């Protein structure tokens, strides 16, 4: 794979089986995925209810961000009372299910895809208070630097998403930016992540890729972050920035956007495994051919005549 | 060929046969028996297969039969097959006539009675030898040597004993088996090379890995030095071409199959190996004899060939009375004076003690179980053969 999905895939699969299936059968599943983040499904009732439920170490944060709304928005009827030792819960009823295969698809896609919808609530706030920004600055272009400069402090999120992490997000009347305080503490990985983290600034300041948003990257804060809790300039983290303009968070594209941003740091990470079984394809070649600068030191000797399992032979 | 005592060594891997006063044996080959059989394998013209073939007649054309052994542990586990090696033995290697005969046989030192009574039945009633005696396999071996003190441990492919003796009294309470030698040694070789894959699990097969081990295997003097040029070199990697004509790499089962006589544990024996097992039978001799029997240990056997054994038991036997005597203080081992004797001949000094037994007592008539005193008194005609 060359990009990450943005959906937990076992919960796609799971409930695309249980939504095709005649004769459900009971089930009781922890399952791990990236950032820290941890389902649990589980048929708790009846085989015929399916309860997924989710723990994320920042989830406090991203209810003061306006998430149960997003989810309630989401989820409707199928929302339920937090599990014991979860974050939040929905409870899918296998009888009361959709009617079209396509009402399937899409909700055990919309099921397998929490994790994003969870973290999507920051974001969805930054989108909509900078189409209200837009509009002020729209009528009044002599003020709107001052409403930029306001919004740049009050209306500023920080989510502390994984320990070695933050992200930083704020409006402004025509973009979106967006900074990961990113480090890797796994020293390989780190030795590395300086080469990916650099060859991606470096990529963004080419003719085909301009498109993109503008992104930038340091190792002090941006000036409008220099103060925010657990940022600290010194201990060898990156600031990589992200300024999503208007083009990049047109109704068409937000969602999207929303899904591929949030995966930044995952996809580097990955990139960086990958990485490594790269190097040691482009090794084991060389070590193939230093094989043909030894085998120049073995006298010539035709090594007899053999039958395919290594056994002896008689002719010629 | 002679008309002194006919002498045989029965040995579990091997039979030895010859005469009183030969210098080393008449004839020797695998003491192994074969029925025809076919197996998506070659054929030829070149030899014909009869129902029974044994010895060097099987070895040689063994891709084309079924081996069997007669013999496991020093006792004969099936006697129609060793019946069909005693035929060959005297009809076809040594072409003799039996009839009145006195021959000399061997077996290990705490065999079932069982298997001597059986042995000796069929000599005096299959071929009629005129007088038989058995000897302790161990006992022979230091006749061979010219000896008559410090303890004789024989190695065979079926038994390693021990059988401590000092000046010409046999200790018959200090007289011990370890059921580990050449053979546990060899189906240890095979499920070492079952790790690399290579599979030798047809009866035949046995006896190419029993050739593998005779002449690619080490005992290793210094294991953590070994498990260096194993683990860390390749200087250890043989290449082995088997009678298939397929090659095979050989590399740390080299030095890691002779070890599990020195630690039989590696091949699921709870009992001590070779120095342990020595030095736990040597101590356990009366305070006076001690030093005479650490003075001149006696190596014996096939399974005692193994290139660094005798290096290795000195070495391990001086490292284990400094843990166990001296407890580990330095001031007296230079004191301990342990010998090895570990001669040339020393694979066949059953059988070469056998021709020498065999001459000292051709002549006394008494000395031998005579076949008229077998069919009086039966298995009780045997209790002349001593404790
Ligand atoms: N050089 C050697 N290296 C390793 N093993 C050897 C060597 N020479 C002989 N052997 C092994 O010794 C065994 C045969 O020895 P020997 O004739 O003394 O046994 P045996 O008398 O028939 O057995 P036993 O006394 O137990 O009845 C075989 O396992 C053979 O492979
Ligand atoms: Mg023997």
Same mark, same amino acid.
């Given at each position: 794979?060359?990009?990450?999905?943005?959906?937990?895939?076992?919960?796609?699969?799971?409930?695309?089986?249980? &939504?095709?299936?005649?004769?459900?059968?009971?089930?009781?599943?922890?399952?791990?995925? /990236?950032?820290?983040?941890? &389902?649990?499904?589980?048929?708790?009732?009846?085989?015929?209810?399916?309860?997924?439920?989710?723990?994320?170490?920042?989830?406090?944060?991203?209810?003061?961000?306006?998430?149960?709304?997003?989810?309630?928005?989401?989820?409707?009827?199928?929302?339920?009372?937090?599990? !014991?030792?979860?974050?939040?819960?929905?409870?899918?009823?296998?009888?009361?299910?959709?009617?079209?295969? *396509?009402?399937?698809?899409?909700?055990?896609?919309?099921?397998?895809?929490?994790?994003?919808?969870?973290?999507?609530?920051?974001?969805?706030?930054? /989108?909509?208070?900078?189409?209200?920004?837009?509009?002020?600055?729209?009528?009044?272009? *002599?003020?709107?630097?001052?409403?930029?400069?306001?919004?740049?402090?009050?209306?500023?999120?920080?989510?502390?998403?994984?320990?070695?992490?933050?992200?930083?997000?704020?409006?402004?009347?025509?973009?979106?930016?967006?900074?990961?305080?990113?480090?890797?503490?796994?020293?390989?990985?780190?030795?590395?992540?300086?080469?990916?983290?650099?060859?991606?600034?470096?990529?963004?300041?080419?003719?085909?890729?301009?498109?993109?948003?503008?992104?930038?990257?340091?190792?002090?804060?941006?000036?409008?972050?220099?103060?925010?809790?657990?940022?600290?300039?010194?201990?060898?983290?990156?600031?990589?920035? /992200?300024?999503? &303009?208007?083009?990049?968070?047109?109704?068409?594209?937000?969602?999207?956007?929303?899904?591929?941003?949030?995966?930044?740091?995952?996809?580097?990470?990955?990139?960086?495994?990958?990485?490594?079984?790269? !190097?040691?394809?482009?090794?084991?070649?060389?070590?193939?051919?230093?094989?043909?600068?030894?085998?120049?030191?073995?006298?010539?000797?035709?090594? *007899?005549?053999?039958?395919?399992?290594?056994?002896? &032979?008689?002719?010629? | 060929?002679?008309?002194?005592?006919?002498?045989?060594?029965?040995?579990?891997?091997?039979?030895?046969?010859?005469?009183?006063?030969?210098?080393?044996?008449?004839?020797?080959?695998?003491?192994?028996?074969?029925?025809?059989?076919?197996?998506?394998?070659?054929?030829?013209?070149?030899? #014909?297969?009869?129902?029974?073939?044994?010895?060097?007649?099987?070895?040689?054309?063994?891709?084309?039969?079924?081996?069997?052994?007669?013999?496991?542990?020093?006792?004969?586990?099936?006697?129609?097959?060793?019946?069909?090696?005693?035929?060959?033995?005297?009809?076809?290697? $040594?072409?003799?006539?039996?009839?009145?005969?006195?021959?000399?046989?061997?077996?290990?030192?705490?065999?079932?009675?069982?298997?001597?009574?059986?042995?000796?039945?069929?000599?005096?009633?299959?071929?009629?030898?005129?007088?038989?005696?058995?000897?302790?396999?161990?006992?022979? %071996?230091?006749?061979?040597?010219? $000896?008559?003190?410090?303890?004789?441990?024989?190695?065979?492919?079926?038994?390693?004993?021990?059988?401590?003796?000092?000046?010409?009294?046999?200790?018959?309470?200090?007289?011990? =088996?370890?059921?580990?030698?050449?053979?546990?040694?060899?189906?240890?070789?095979?499920?070492?090379?079952?790790?690399?894959?290579?599979?030798?699990?047809?009866?035949?097969?046995?006896?190419?890995?029993?050739?593998?081990?005779?002449?690619?295997?080490?005992?290793? @003097?210094?294991?953590?030095?070994?498990?260096?040029?194993?683990?860390?070199?390749?200087?250890?990697?043989?290449?082995?071409?088997?009678?298939?004509?397929?090659?095979?790499?050989?590399?740390?089962? =080299? @030095?890691?199959?002779?070890?599990?006589?020195?630690?039989?544990?590696?091949?699921?024996?709870?009992?001590?190996?070779?120095?342990?097992?020595?030095?736990?039978?040597? #101590?356990?001799?009366?305070?006076?004899?001690?030093?005479?029997?650490?003075?001149?240990?006696?190596?014996?056997?096939?399974?005692?060939?193994?290139?660094? $054994?005798? %290096?290795?038991?000195?070495?391990?036997?001086?490292?284990?009375?400094?843990?166990?005597? $001296?407890?580990?203080?330095?001031? =007296?081992?230079?004191?301990?004076?342990?010998?090895?004797?570990?001669?040339?001949?020393?694979?066949?000094?059953?059988?070469?003690?056998?021709?020498?037994?065999?001459?000292?007592?051709? #002549?006394?008539?008494?000395?031998?179980?005579?076949?008229?005193?077998?069919?009086? @008194?039966?298995?009780?005609?045997?209790?002349?053969?001593?404790?």
């Amino acid at each position: 794979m060359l990009s990450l999905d943005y959906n937990n895939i076992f919960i796609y699969e799971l409930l695309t089986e249980r &939504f095709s299936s005649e004769n459900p059968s009971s089930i009781d599943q922890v399952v791990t995925d /990236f950032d820290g983040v941890t &389902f649990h499904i589980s048929t708790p009732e009846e085989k015929t209810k399916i309860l997924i439920s989710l723990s994320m170490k920042c989830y406090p944060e991203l209810v003061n961000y306006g998430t149960l709304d997003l989810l309630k928005q989401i989820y409707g009827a199928y929302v339920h009372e937090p599990e !014991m030792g979860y974050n939040f819960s929905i409870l899918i009823d296998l009888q009361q299910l959709p009617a079209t295969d *396509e009402e399937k698809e899409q909700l055990a896609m919309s099921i397998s895809m929490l994790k994003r919808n969870v973290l999507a609530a920051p974001f969805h706030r930054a /989108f909509t208070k900078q189409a209200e920004l837009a509009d002020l600055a729209r009528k009044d272009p *002599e003020n709107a630097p001052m409403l930029d400069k306001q919004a740049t402090s009050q209306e500023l999120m920080a989510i502390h998403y994984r320990d070695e992490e933050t992200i930083v997000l704020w409006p402004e009347h025509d973009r979106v930016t967006v900074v990961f305080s990113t480090k890797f503490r796994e020293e390989t990985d780190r030795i590395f992540g300086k080469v990916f983290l650099q060859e991606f600034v470096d990529a963004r300041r080419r003719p085909a890729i301009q498109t993109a948003p503008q992104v930038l990257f340091s190792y002090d804060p941006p000036l409008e972050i220099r103060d925010i809790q657990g940022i600290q300039k010194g201990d060898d983290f990156g600031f990589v920035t /992200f300024v999503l &303009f208007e083009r990049h968070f047109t109704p068409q594209n937000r969602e999207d956007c929303i899904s591929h941003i949030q995966v930044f740091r995952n996809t580097l990470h990955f990139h960086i495994k990958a990485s490594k079984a790269y !190097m040691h394809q482009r090794m084991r070649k060389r070590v193939a051919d230093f094989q043909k600068v030894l085998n120049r030191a073995k006298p010539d000797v035709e090594l *007899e005549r053999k039958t395919a399992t290594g056994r002896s &032979f008689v002719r010629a | 060929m002679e008309s002194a005592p006919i002498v045989l060594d029965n040995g579990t891997g091997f039979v030895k046969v010859g005469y009183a006063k030969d210098n080393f044996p008449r004839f020797q080959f695998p003491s192994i028996v074969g029925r025809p059989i076919l197996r998506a394998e070659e054929k030829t013209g070149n030899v #014909q297969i009869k129902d029974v073939m044994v010895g060097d007649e099987a070895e040689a054309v063994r891709s084309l039969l079924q081996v069997k052994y007669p013999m496991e542990n020093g006792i004969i586990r099936d006697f129609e097959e060793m019946n069909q090696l005693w035929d060959y033995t005297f009809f076809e290697k $040594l072409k003799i006539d039996p009839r009145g005969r006195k021959i000399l046989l061997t077996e290990p030192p705490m065999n079932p009675v069982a298997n001597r009574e059986k042995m000796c039945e069929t000599m005096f009633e299959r071929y009629g030898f005129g007088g038989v005696y058995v000897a302790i396999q161990a006992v022979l %071996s230091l006749y061979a040597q010219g $000896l008559s003190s410090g303890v004789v441990v024989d190695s065979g492919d079926g038994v390693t004993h021990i059988v401590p003796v000092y000046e010409s009294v046999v200790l018959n309470h200090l007289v011990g =088996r370890l059921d580990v030698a050449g053979r546990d040694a060899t189906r240890y070789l095979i499920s070492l090379l079952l790790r690399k894959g290579y599979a030798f699990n047809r009866t035949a097969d046995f006896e190419t890995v029993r050739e593998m081990k005779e002449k690619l295997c080490y005992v290793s @003097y210094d294991l953590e030095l070994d498990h260096k040029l194993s683990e860390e070199t390749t200087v250890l990697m043989r290449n082995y071409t088997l009678p298939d004509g397929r090659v095979i790499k050989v590399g740390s089962e =080299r @030095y890691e199959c002779p070890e599990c006589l020195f630690q039989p544990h590696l091949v699921g024996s709870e009992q001590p190996g070779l120095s342990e097992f020595i030095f736990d039978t040597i #101590q356990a001799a009366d305070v006076d004899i001690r030093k005479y029997l650490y003075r001149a240990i006696v190596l014996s056997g096939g399974s005692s060939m193994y290139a660094g $054994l005798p %290096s290795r038991l000195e070495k391990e036997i001086k490292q284990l009375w400094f843990e166990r005597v $001296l407890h580990g203080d330095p001031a =007296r081992l230079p004191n301990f004076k342990v010998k090895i004797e570990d001669a040339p001949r020393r694979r066949h000094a059953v059988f070469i003690g056998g021709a020498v037994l065999a001459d000292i007592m051709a #002549q006394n008539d008494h000395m031998w179980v005579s076949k008229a005193e077998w069919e009086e @008194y039966g298995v009780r005609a045997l209790d002349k053969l001593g404790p």
